[PDB]
Amino acid sequence: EEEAVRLYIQWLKDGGPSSGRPPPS
């Protein structure tokens, strides 16, 4: 993947949008 990601993953790597944190994308 060439981004969306990079910001992303981090997001789900954390715990997903279940985090206080919404989509990269």
The secondary structure of the chain, three-state, reads CCCCCCCCCHHHHHCCCCCCCCCCC
> Which amino acid makes up residue 1?
E
**What are the angstrom distances between the C-alpha of 12 and each of 2, 3, 16, 17, 25?**
16, 14, 3, 7, 12
Q: How many independent structural domains does the chain possess?
A: 1
Sign of CA dihedral 19, 22, 23, 24: negative
Sign of CA dihedral 14, 17, 20, 22: positive
**CB-count exposure of residue 8 (10 Å: 0-12, 13-18, 19+):** middle
Method used experimentally: NMR
Range of the domain at 2: 1-25
Q: What phi and psi values does residue 3 have, to the nearest 5 degrees?
A: 65, -170
Sign of CA dihedral 13, 17, 20, 1: positive
For residue 17, give both structure tokens.
């949008």
Q: Are 5 and 25 in contact (CB under 8 A)?
A: no
For residue 18, give both structure tokens.
């279940």
